[PDB]
Write a protein that binds this DNA or RNA. Structure first.
Ligand code: ZN
Lengths: 87, 147, 356, 49, 96, 166, 20, 110, 58
RNA sequence: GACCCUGUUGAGCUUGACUCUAGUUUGACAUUGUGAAAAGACAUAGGAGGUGUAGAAUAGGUGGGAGCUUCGGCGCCAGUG
RNA sequence: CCUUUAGUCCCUCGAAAUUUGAGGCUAGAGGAGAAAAGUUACCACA
RNA sequence: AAGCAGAAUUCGGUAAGCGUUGGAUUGUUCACCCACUAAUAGGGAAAGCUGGGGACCGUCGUGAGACAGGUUA
């Protein structure tokens, strides 16, 4: 229970880590015009959700995670790990 | 019926959040403003705008039902059929408008899967059904088709 | 039975009919090859025999299967920009900013937009509530392009229950002139009135009349639009009740009412018009007893009207001949539309010019 | 990642925090730690770009 | 309303008066911009009525339903200053 | 798209012949060999198998190809190396029965059998690189030249083998 | 800017641009 | 959920076994039936979880002890009914487990 | 370049992919070489295949 | 707090007679002419025509019709309709 | 004046040909009067 | 009592005699991981500290609120 915990529920994000990327993007616009983003760990998928709503049209976002992720539109989801050269 | 559905498949915001948004503007809260309808209900459309008459009766998501176990008396079988509309709740005219599902309530159900042939040779797509249980005590809706 | 088994027989029966001259059986004729194609199409796609044989006679085998495949799959959602408020580029950009995937519906409309998906309800978006677009169907665009109304005319829309077409005439008329919007249903008329006020239309009169009373009521319209109520054989995807609830009785009363409606539209219009005396008849059905048979009836009992070029870019020519029925040769100007060919609803457009 | 790319990582503050920062220094051109307000003040987490 | 009427003014006035008005609308376009940009773009033309030139009131005329066509006469005006003046306005419009 | 793989081992293919129809051929980046989209009929279930082969040179779309031991010895069919006779061009051959094709998949290679061994059934196959191999007769193979052509620009000369050459 | 510069009364003398 | 999860995880996953053990189990226990049996257990585990979620929401709006008691009985009664449907799969799995416990230990590579 | 069609019998074949040819009259696709529909080497072995099939049948 | 009622208000539903007629509005007709240039429909006398699917094939349609024949092609019959 | 109910298959109109729809007839049901009136398990205030 | 060979267990019965832990709570959520241990069972006496998270009139208006206007347990 927290201020960001409640407000994230009303906004519809999966965790409050979504807002961490939101304020980071406000300070530094790396999630601007540039197209390709690689999310190496999205267990809930909040960072993928934040990207899915602020990138330029026709961008590419790919996220990997050891745990299964419920599908998010316009986001590529991976069940593979990160510490393996198969990944 | 299940097999037919299997092959075919192979082929907004809530009222409560709207109340929170509205009450934010009207900071002064009148005692007893919210009227949470604690009875099971059926609504239908995802998003709708209600008249000011009923814009104070809030129906929670958890109490909403969309299907019912409907029994056909002649063809002795029961199939889970979607609910189309609530026609009459014989306890309160307000409950009919609010879609409250109580015992003895007449609802209109989609009977297209059963395939009932009418006297004109057509296939029936909607018939009345009376709820024969207490959806508030038993977490489901049971009905018998009026055929 | 086994539904996937029916699909295999359907495909097997079609290829046999395509190459019956060399690939056949010992003594079974192609008459019962087609008849076998009737049962398994009925059992698989859930049609009754009367409509299925009717549809099978309309098309040849491999096109027919594409038609039955198209009827099960839904159609894309398309919106019509209100020219009275904005134009397409901002409304596309405005909805893109809100998370709606948009492309132009095609090169044939400067007003329609096609939506893949969205993160917000399309019917509750702020520019929707402002009157910047209306959810319509691509087939509904066509009748008003055939009947292009200019400014400062009087128009008659004989069935405007949803309201998409009446608003389109108002946009093309630039909110000038008079539009008679008519619905025989009070319940559906309330939605039309709401659509009119939401979309900012000021030059309309909503009347609740039976469309066959109109020459008696007012008469003299420059342009009259007629979407006759029909079986709905081209809107099967939205209304599955058509597949089984259309028999010989229905297909006899419906063309009779449509024939009576068309004559009323002809008498309603003004032949001596300074801008035009055009009548457009449209239908969301594919059957010939409701298209090109009502058109032939109008031309045979009113020799003071003539079919003209419809003007739409895409479409298929109308049928001149059918099961022993010979039509007027001018019917080739009328156009047809099919879901499998163009990803639009089954539709039919006809356009008349009054000369006396 | 392309020349001129941006790399952001959550790093717990510890005695290895400075050793990892030296890596981005020799591998990138601009470095900074942010700790946006959403991160709990009790938490030792930090975000390095 | 004044922008459209002023281009009409510039058409039929002496060379220096036309130049003065042309310079004035250069500032008007520069300071406001998008408020008058749709007048020079035919796709952004409003379709909610017809333009009324001889209206009794400023709002009575529907000026966003018309398009500034006068550039096709002022581009061939006899005064080089006017021609350069017209080119000045479009240069500001293209930079909007 | 999908890897080019043969049908799974089964009684029907190993003892009879199965009819299949091809629908189209699709080119994919990373190789010049054109994949062939094929639809088969399941002998046990009323379902169609979606599998992809490699389009050989000369074939088209719309054959009633035969898949089995006693299939027609034509281009577009497959056949166990036992049935096909000597000197025949074979493509996309199996090292063992069950690997769904391993040898000779690049755009234009082929394998010609140079002798069959009946007792303890083995078939001898020549590799495109000029090597000699022996594979079990029960393996399958695609008959014909795999499409792609362009076999006029292959330089075959070695510094050492030239010294070996007479 | 330009509007003010052309608004001053000494812009409209009548000097012909052949006699500069 | 704990008891269902223990059953699913304790039995060997045929995909990860050595080929000799994978084939031997197929002959012994009809691998197709083995997958069907485990699927019903997984299906029943998910169904019970959704039943629990549904009735917890209902209880939070209940207005008296009688209504709370009826909802609890309905939630428990439906969970009991689903387990009774698992009768045939559970008998099959117990026989396999007893057979597996007695199987000889063969080292595939030795 | 433009090549002849076996089925439609007319000069209506064009290249679509690296080794894919297509004729739009009968909507038939050819599977051939990079630049030629039929390689001379491909013709020789098919002739050899036909000859051995005659020998086997005889 | 909830329950019942009253008064004012809002949202909604229903009633608010019949016969002529002002106003308003649709169609046809009348003043009312002369020319000229076009367009349509009526008058003959001609010419040329029919491709939804299947059918080898471009079947206006209607009636007889199993034999006709520039004497070798047709017909019928079998299809497909 | 329209709409429903049952009837003779009694007349007219329209449609298709090997049948319908709408009117018409028999007698039940709906629609003092532009001043206002009635009514609601609804809303707001008292 | 159970394919319970041994070891380890599982289900049930009598039993309250005897015990039922140390940390995290510093990333995400249905708040629950790290271990140690023989085990880390659930409740009643329903209780106090500590952190988290008022109601009447009056006036001016009401398609709606405003008042450092008055009084008071
Ligand atoms: Zn061809």
């Amino acid at each position: 229970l927290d201020k960001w915990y409640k407000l994230a529920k009303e906004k519809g994000y999966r965790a409050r880590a979504a807002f961490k990327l939101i304020q980071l993007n406000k300070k530094y616009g790396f999630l601007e015009k540039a197209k390709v983003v690689l999310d190496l760990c999205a267990a809930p998928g909040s960072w993928c959700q934040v990207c899915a709503e602020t990138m330029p049209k026709d961008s590419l976002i790919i996220g990997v995670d050891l745990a299964p992720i419920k599908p998010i539109p316009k986001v590529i989801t991976f069940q593979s790990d990160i510490t393996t050269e198969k990944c | 019926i299940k097999n037919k559905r299997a092959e075919k498949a192979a082929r907004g915001i809530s009222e409560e959040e709207m109340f929170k948004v509205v009450k934010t503007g009207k900071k002064t809260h009148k005692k007893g403003w919210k009227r949470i309808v604690t009875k099971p209900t059926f609504v239908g459309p995802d998003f709708t705008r209600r008249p000011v008459k009923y814009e104070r009766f809030i129906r929670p998501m958890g109490l909403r039902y969309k299907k019912a176990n409907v029994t056909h008396p002649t063809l002795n079988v029961t199939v889970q059929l979607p609910i189309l509309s609530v026609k009459k709740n014989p306890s309160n005219p307000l409950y009919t408008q609010l879609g409250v599902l109580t015992k003895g309530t007449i609802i209109e159900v989609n009977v297209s899967d059963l395939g009932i042939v009418t006297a004109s040779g057509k296939i029936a797509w909607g018939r009345y059904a009376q709820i024969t249980n207490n959806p508030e005590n038993d977490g489901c809706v049971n009905a018998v088709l009026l055929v | 039975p086994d539904l996937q088994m029916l699909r295999t027989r359907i495909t097997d029966t079609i290829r046999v009919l395509e190459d019956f001259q060399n690939l056949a059986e010992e003594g079974r004729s192609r008459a019962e090859y087609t008849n076998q194609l009737l049962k398994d199409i009925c059992a698989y796609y859930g049609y009754n025999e009367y409509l299925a044989e009717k549809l099978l006679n309309l098309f040849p085998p491999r096109e027919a299967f594409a038609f039955f495949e198209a009827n099960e799959t839904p159609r894309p959602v398309v919106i019509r920009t209100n020219t009275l408020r904005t134009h397409r580029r901002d409304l596309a950009q405005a909805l893109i900013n809100r998370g709606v995937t948009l492309e132009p519906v095609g090169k044939w409309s400067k007003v329609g937009l096609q939506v893949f998906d969205s993160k917000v309800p399309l019917g509750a978006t702020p520019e929707y509530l402002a009157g910047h677009y209306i959810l319509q169907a691509a087939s509904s665009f066509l009748p008003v392009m055939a009947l292009c109304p200019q400014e400062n005319e009087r128009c008659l829309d004989m069935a405007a229950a949803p309201g998409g077409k009446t608003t389109h005439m108002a946009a093309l008329m630039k909110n000038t002139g008079v539009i008679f919007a008519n619905d025989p249903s009070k319940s559906r008329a309330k939605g039309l009135i709401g659509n009119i006020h939401r979309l900012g239309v000021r030059n309309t009169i909503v009347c609740n009349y039976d469309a066959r009373e109109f020459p008696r009521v007012i008469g003299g319209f420059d342009r009259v639009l007629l979407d006759a109520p029909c079986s709905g054989t081209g809107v099967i995807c939205k209304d599955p009740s058509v597949k089984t609830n259309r028999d010989a009785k229905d297909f006899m009363q419906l063309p009779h009412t449509q024939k009576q409606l068309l004559l009323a539209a002809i008498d309603s219009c003004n032949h001596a018009s300074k801008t035009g005396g055009y009548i457009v008849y449209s239908t969301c059905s594919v059957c010939v007893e409701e298209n090109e048979e009502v058109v032939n009836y109008a031309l045979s009992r009113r020799p003071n009207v003539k079919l003209v070029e419809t003007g739409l870019p895409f479409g298929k020519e109308g049928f001149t001949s059918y099961m022993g029925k010979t039509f007027h040769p001018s019917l080739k100007l009328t156009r047809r539309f099919y879901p499998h060919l163009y990803n639009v609803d089954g539709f039919f457009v006809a356009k008349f010019k009054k000369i006396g | 990642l392309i020349e001129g790319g941006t790399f952001v990582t959550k790093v717990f503050r510890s005695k290895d925090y400075n050793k990892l920062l030296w890596v981005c220094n020799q591998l990138f051109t601009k470095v900074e730690a942010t700790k946006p307000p959403s991160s709990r003040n009790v938490s030792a987490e930090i975000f390095v770009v | 309303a004044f922008c459209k009427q002023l281009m009409t003014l510039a058409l039929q006035v002496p060379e220096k008066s036309s130049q003065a008005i042309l310079g004035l609308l250069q500032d008007v376009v520069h300071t406001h911009g998008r408020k008058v940009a749709a007048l020079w773009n035919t796709e952004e033309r409003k379709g909610d009525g017809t333009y009324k030139p001889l209206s009794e009131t400023v709002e009575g005329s529907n000026p966003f339903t018309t398009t500034i066509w006068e550039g096709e006469l002022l581009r061939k005006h006899y005064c080089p200053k006017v021609r350069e003046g017209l080119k000045a306005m479009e240069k500001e419009l293209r930079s909007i | 798209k999908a890897p080019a793989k043969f049908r799974p081992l089964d009684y029907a293919e190993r003892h009879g012949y199965i009819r299949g129809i091809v629908k189209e051929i699709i080119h994919d980046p990373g190789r010049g060999a054109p994949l062939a989209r094929v639809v088969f009929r399941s002998p046990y279930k009323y379902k169609q198998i979606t599998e992809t082969f490699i389009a050989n040179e000369g074939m088209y779309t719309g054959q009633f190809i035969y898949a089995g031991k006693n299939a027609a010895l034509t281009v577009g069919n497959i056949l166990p190396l036992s049935s096909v006779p000597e000197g025949t061009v074979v493509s996309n051959v199996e090292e063992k029965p069950g690997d769904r094709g391993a040898l000779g998949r690049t755009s234009g290679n082929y394998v010609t059998v140079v002798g069959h061994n009946p007792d303890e059934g083995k078939t001898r196959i020549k590799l495109p690189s000029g090597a000699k191999k022996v594979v079990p007769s029960s393996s399958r193979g695609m008959i014909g030249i795999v499409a792609g052509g362009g076999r006029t620009d292959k330089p075959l000369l070695k510094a050492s083998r030239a010294k070996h050459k007479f | 800017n330009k509007a003010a510069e052309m608004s001053v009364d000494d812009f409209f003398k009548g000097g012909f641009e052949i006699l500069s | 959920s704990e008891k269902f999860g223990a059953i699913i995880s304790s039995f060997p996953v045929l995909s990860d076994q050595h080929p000799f053990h994978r084939d031997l189990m197929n002959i012994l226990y009809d691998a197709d039936h083995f997958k069907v049996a485990l699927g019903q257990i997984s299906t029943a585990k998910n169904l019970i979880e959704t039943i629990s979620r549904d009735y917890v929401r209902l209880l939070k709006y209940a207005q008296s002890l009688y209504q709370c008691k009826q909802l609890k009985r309905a939630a428990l009664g439906r969970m009991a009914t689903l387990i009774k449907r698992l009768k045939d799969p559970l008998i099959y799995l117990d026989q396999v487990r007893q057979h597996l416990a007695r199987l000889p230990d063969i080292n595939p590579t030795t | 370049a433009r090549y002849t069609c076996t089925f439609c019998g007319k000069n209506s074949v064009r290249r679509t992919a690296v080794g894919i040819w297509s004729c739009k009259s009968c909507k038939k696709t050819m599977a051939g070489g990079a630049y030629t529909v039929s390689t001379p080497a491909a013709a020789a072995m098919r002739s050899t295949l036909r000859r051995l099939r005659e020998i086997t049948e005889a």
